[PDB]
Write an enzyme that holds these catalytic residues in place. Structure first.
Site, short mmCIF file in Angstrom:
data_model
loop_
_atom_site.label_atom_id
_atom_site.label_comp_id
_atom_site.label_asym_id
_atom_site.label_seq_id
_atom_site.Cartn_x
_atom_site.Cartn_y
_atom_site.Cartn_z
N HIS A 184 -6.11 0.22 2.63
CA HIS A 184 -4.99 0.70 3.45
C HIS A 184 -4.85 2.22 3.42
O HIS A 184 -4.22 2.81 4.32
CB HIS A 184 -3.68 0.07 2.97
CG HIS A 184 -3.33 -1.23 3.62
ND1 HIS A 184 -3.30 -1.39 4.99
CD2 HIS A 184 -2.95 -2.42 3.10
CE1 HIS A 184 -2.93 -2.62 5.28
NE2 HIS A 184 -2.71 -3.27 4.15
N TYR A 196 -3.84 -10.83 9.78
CA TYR A 196 -4.89 -10.60 8.78
C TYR A 196 -6.20 -11.26 9.16
O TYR A 196 -7.23 -10.60 9.29
CB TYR A 196 -4.50 -11.19 7.42
CG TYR A 196 -3.32 -10.53 6.74
CD1 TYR A 196 -2.01 -10.74 7.22
CD2 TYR A 196 -3.50 -9.69 5.64
CE1 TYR A 196 -0.92 -10.12 6.62
CE2 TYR A 196 -2.41 -9.07 5.03
CZ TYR A 196 -1.12 -9.29 5.53
OH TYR A 196 -0.03 -8.66 4.95
N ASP A 202 10.07 -10.01 9.43
CA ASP A 202 9.92 -10.85 8.24
C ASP A 202 9.72 -12.32 8.56
O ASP A 202 9.05 -13.04 7.82
CB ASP A 202 11.13 -10.69 7.32
CG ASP A 202 11.11 -9.37 6.60
OD1 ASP A 202 9.99 -8.88 6.36
OD2 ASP A 202 12.19 -8.84 6.26
N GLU A 255 -3.65 -4.71 9.36
CA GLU A 255 -4.18 -5.75 8.50
C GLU A 255 -5.61 -6.19 8.75
O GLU A 255 -6.38 -6.35 7.81
CB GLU A 255 -3.21 -6.94 8.53
CG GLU A 255 -1.77 -6.53 8.06
CD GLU A 255 -1.76 -5.89 6.67
OE1 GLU A 255 -2.76 -6.07 5.95
OE2 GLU A 255 -0.78 -5.23 6.30
N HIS A 285 -7.98 -4.49 -1.23
CA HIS A 285 -7.23 -4.56 0.00
C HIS A 285 -6.27 -3.37 0.06
O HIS A 285 -6.29 -2.59 1.03
CB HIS A 285 -6.44 -5.86 0.07
CG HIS A 285 -5.65 -6.01 1.32
ND1 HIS A 285 -6.16 -6.57 2.48
CD2 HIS A 285 -4.37 -5.68 1.61
CE1 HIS A 285 -5.23 -6.59 3.40
NE2 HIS A 285 -4.13 -6.05 2.90
N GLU A 286 -5.43 -3.22 -0.96
CA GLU A 286 -4.46 -2.11 -0.95
C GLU A 286 -5.14 -0.74 -0.87
O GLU A 286 -4.65 0.15 -0.22
CB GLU A 286 -3.55 -2.13 -2.18
CG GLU A 286 -2.76 -3.41 -2.33
CD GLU A 286 -1.99 -3.83 -1.07
OE1 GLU A 286 -1.68 -2.93 -0.26
OE2 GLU A 286 -1.70 -5.05 -0.90
N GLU A 323 0.76 -1.25 0.00
CA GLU A 323 0.00 0.00 0.00
C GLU A 323 0.81 1.32 0.00
O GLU A 323 0.47 2.25 0.76
CB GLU A 323 -0.92 -0.02 1.22
CG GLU A 323 -0.14 0.08 2.54
CD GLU A 323 0.11 -1.26 3.22
OE1 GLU A 323 0.30 -2.29 2.51
OE2 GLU A 323 0.13 -1.28 4.47
ZN LIG Z 1 -2.47 -5.35 4.04
#
Ligand SMILES: [Zn+2]
Ligand SMILES: [Yb+3]
EC number: 3.3.2.6
Length: 610
Positions: free
Chosen positions: A299, A383, A375, A318, A295-296, A271
């Site tokens: 954001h 999510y 990461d 998320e 979704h993006e 995003e």
């Molecule tokens: Zn996301």
């Protein structure tokens, strides 16, 4: 109320705050380095401030200048993934709210974990190199010195010098281009971001880019050969934007462009403000993966306006985004579809929890990232467990329309801020004060701090899911003498999403007898499908069911594109199947060098190599 960012080694916001960044840099493809000056406007939040610390990772510092003079600074010893703290001695002591601009001259490492440099052969045109960045979560410190925490928000302007024939783009509004006065063979692209943003949203791409307009405030960008396909694939963008505005309030970013990256982009989408980055694996030809765009887009409100204070609260970013995403798709395609997608997400959550183990720390909604590389901890938990919580609160508090009212006020209330799970929870109780008795019935400690599946599963309409389950069940319970009943007409009334769900339901009981899988190819010809989510699940089912013919197909998909959500499970499946194990490891070793830095490191740990 005091909370620290355990992922940052920089002075926290309570000491000082960066208000602006003016970046002047040049992209050196021959050296694979980004060179330039990062001028930070820093505001003191304390009395008599004499020094401050900034985050850095594999950066080379040429010098630091304040008020026209070079000043003292010192780099501490590297702290693994966190990089190296950079302490700067200020020439003069600052009072509270006093500001000064520190200009740091620096050079990036060709090994920057924020960047991936691609030779001409790795691109579509084959005649020009390409560079793209990815700062979330904490990789901005690997591009430039900075307080690498989402608890600080700043604006920025930037000028980037790049070979004349290439094009630079950033998470900001384009403010012109001109020849580079100090080197005729280059162009300087200018940018400005007027809306305060956490630094993980800073983004840069340099390549032989072309664009095409697809809506009143949207241009799609990519190399020449992907333009037409992308323009069609993402044609629903403006309508999704309009729905998002209706759900969250005004879109404050001006433009909403799309950049379609080379196959190795690590995520489905990112995003970055004004310029969302997406994987080219979304180019299915039928817009069936457009939820990733919704979704993006979401954001732009949940994440970019209301931001998580530290990565321990990533679910705030998320979960709310997935929640908005599903409303956009529900508006576009019907409430029954939202329930279907909502139910599929629960299935992905079960998968994640089973994968990590039900008591594993990473399956907690709110995690403690102290000494944990973000990461490595990344998964579908924030999510989906986050989404599950909101969907559960939605049915508890009275329905979608009521909860959407809380969502809009929540965005309004915390716009341009960085908040914690407690800030979110206090506002929820405040908004729904007249329903606190109801709110007091949820097991908060379990939902927010306990590992494993949530203590309660929301209610889901099953209309579009039933056929998927029924077909999945036929195959699972089928014995050899039932395989002949299967036929191409079994898929007649299924949409690509139901097809995908059919595979997901079946993958959860893998392996199936090898003869069942062969029959499935025989009658449904899944080998012919290029929809990446569908193909991904099909190849996993094949490998997990030990069909050797799938090995080359799985290895191929694993390396020709690098979306981690597909590449990591494929290499892992390939490595758990004794017949492809050595080939998996070998393919990884041979590709490593030209892989995205973060993807290489993670597949490396999954395969337990090096
Ligand atoms: Zn996301
Ligand atoms: Yb003072």
């Amino acid at each position: 109320p005091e909370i620290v960012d355990t992922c940052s080694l920089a002075s926290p916001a309570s000491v000082c705050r960066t208000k602006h960044l003016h970046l002047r840099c040049s992209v050196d493809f021959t050296r694979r380095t980004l060179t330039g000056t990062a001028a930070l406007t820093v505001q003191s939040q304390e009395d008599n401030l004499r020094s401050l610390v900034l985050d850095t990772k594999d950066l080379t510092i040429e010098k630091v200048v304040i008020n026209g003079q070079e000043v003292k600074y010192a780099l501490g010893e590297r702290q693994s993934y966190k990089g190296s703290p950079m302490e700067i001695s200020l020439p003069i002591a600052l009072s509270k709210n006093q500001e000064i601009v520190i200009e740091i001259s620096f050079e990036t490492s060709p090994k920057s974990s924020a960047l991936q440099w691609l030779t001409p052969e790795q691109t579509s045109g084959k005649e020009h190199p390409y560079l793209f960045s990815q700062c979330q979560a904490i990789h901005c410190r690997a591009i430039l010195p900075c307080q690498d925490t989402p608890s600080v928000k700043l604006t920025y302007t930037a000028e980037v010098s790049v070979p004349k024939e290439l094009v630079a783009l950033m998470s900001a509004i384009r403010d012109g281009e001109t020849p580079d006065p100090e080197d005729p063979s280059r162009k300087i692209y200018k940018f400005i971001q007027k809306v305060p943003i956490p630094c993980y949203l800073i983004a840069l791409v340099v390549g032989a880019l072309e664009s095409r307009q697809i809506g009143p405030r949207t241009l799609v960008w990519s190399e020449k050969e992907q333009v037409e396909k992308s323009a069609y694939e993402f044609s629903e963008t403006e309508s999704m934007l309009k729905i998002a505005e209706d759900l969250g309030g005004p879109y404050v970013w001006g433009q909403y462009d799309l950049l379609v990256l080379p196959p190795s982009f690590p995520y489905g989408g990112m995003e970055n403000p004004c310029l969302t980055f997406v994987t080219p694996t979304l180019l299915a030809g039928d817009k069936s993966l457009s939820n990733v765009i919704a979704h993006e887009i979401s954001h732009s409100w949940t994440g970019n306006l209301v931001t998580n204070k530290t990565w321990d609260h990533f679910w705030l970013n998320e979960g709310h985004t997935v929640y908005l995403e599903r409303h956009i798709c529900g508006r576009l395609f019907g409430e029954k579809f939202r329930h279907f997608n909502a139910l599929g997400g629960w299935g992905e959550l079960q998968n994640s929890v089973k994968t990590f183990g039900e008591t594993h720390p990473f399956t907690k909604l709110v995690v403690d990232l102290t000494d944990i590389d973000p990461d490595v901890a990344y998964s579908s938990v924030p999510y989906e467990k986050g989404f599950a919580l909101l969907f559960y609160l939605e049915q508890l508090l009275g329905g979608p329309e009521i909860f959407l009212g809380f969502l809009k006020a929540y965005v309004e209330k915390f716009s341009y801020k960085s908040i914690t799970t407690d800030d979110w929870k206090d506002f929820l109780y405040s908004y729904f004060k007249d329903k606190v008795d109801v709110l007091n019935q949820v097991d908060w400690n379990a939902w927010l701090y306990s590992p494993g599946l949530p203590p309660i599963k929301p209610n889901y309409d099953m209309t579009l899911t039933n056929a998927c389950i029924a077909l999945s069940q036929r195959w699972i319970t089928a014995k050899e003498d039932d395989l002949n009943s299967f036929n191409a007409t079994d898929l007649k009334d299924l949409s690509s999403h139901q097809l995908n769900e059919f595979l997901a339901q079946t993958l959860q009981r893998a392996p199936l007898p090898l003869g069942h899988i062969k029959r499935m190819q025989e009658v449904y010809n899944f080998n012919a499908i290029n929809n990446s989510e569908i193909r991904f699940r099909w190849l996993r089912l094949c490998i997990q069911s030990k069909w050797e013919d799938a090995i080359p197909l799985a290895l191929k998909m694993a390396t020709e594109q690098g979306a981690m959500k597909f590449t990591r499970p494929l290499f892992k499946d390939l490595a758990a199947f004794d017949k492809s194990h050595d080939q998996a490891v070998r393919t990884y070793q041979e590709h490593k060098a030209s892989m995205h830095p973060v993807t290489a490191m993670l597949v490396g740990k999954d395969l337990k190599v090096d």
